[PDB]
């Protein structure tokens with residue numbers, strides 16, 4: 544029931560879900576494209592879920 | 599240009615857009631921060 | 646919207662990406678995206694420090710890239726802090742950019758001119774310059790070496806003058822990189838630029854956040870000298886009704902323009918004034934059917 548963890552009914556697999564659900568640089572470009580403001584994207588929650596964001 | 603504009607509804611900032619090509623036309627107010635999206639159906643407008 | 650607006654936005658973006666650092670690019674892109682912005686709007690969108698935006702705003706004001714507006718308004722809590730609005734003056738910005746690039750290339754041309762002369766002679770003990778014109782009177786009687794007046798030291802040749810090709814290459818590397826600026830000002834000078842202000846920039850604003858402390862509505866002050874279409878559809882039956890109306894205003898107009906009874910008639914002869922086919926058509930339709938079988942917050946308002 545928690546939105547932080549996503550469950551796959553067809554596979555029986557639990558995965559971690561983040562507020563900024565970005566796991567690829569393409570997803571990062573899609574997230575920056577979807578911004579209607581010029582607000583910066585915080586890297587504090589970008590570490591959450593997707594393990595590496597610096598490189 | 600005329601159909602879209604920045605607005606304040608219920609002391610909340612947003613964008614008013616006119617969804618005119620759809621039948622019937624609607625007045626869509628979109629939250630700037632993404633909190634709430636509200637569409638007004640124009641078939642029930644009195645004044 | 647306006648392609649010229651997109652062009653001058655590209656101008657501002659390219660000049661801040663070329664001749665300015667990244668934080669300048671950030672604040673300039675923030676002002677270009679949201680047309681009118683205050684200091685709290687920048688501190689909310691960019692998470693920037695006041696001491697960090699200090700040199701940025703100072704440099705962008707000195708280069709006339711960001712216009713500052715000193716309007717204060719009246720919030721409901723009446724805490725009217727002197728908020729400053731950061732916007733863009735497009736003719737002022739393009740004039741400043743054109744003047745800066747013209748002064749850079751003119752100063753480089755003057756540096757090339759001052760490098761075009763011969764080398765000259767340096768005195769390293771006293772660290773004193775000597776041109777070819779003023780070193781004529783300092784030679785000895787031995788006719789061997791340039792002797793200084795103060796140090797009496799053998800002078801050495803300057804390395805300047807031989808860097809003429811280096812300055813020419815610097816001009817070549819500046820000029821091809823600034824070529825998009827020249828190509829874009831070719832389109833700008835062939836177009837018409839409207840003079841925008843704070844009120845003009847208010848017409849194209851983008852909200853930075855949900856709750857803005859600074860109100861964007863302009864508050865004027867006294868003493869500052871610084872339609873509808875309606876259609877009528879008639880199904881070919883009510884034309885006689887409109888003619889009945891037309892003759893009715895005709896007859897009331899003739900009645901109101903008629904002579905009075907005392908005018909057209911003499912009043913001296915009277916006393917003085919003082920104090921069923923439905924069954925038939927049903928049977929008809931039955932007969933035709935049988936035959937066809939046979940052969941087959943509140944404010945003031947106005948309504949607009």
Ligand SMILES: [Zn+2]
Nearest residue numbers: 768770771796
């Ligand atoms: Zn010397």
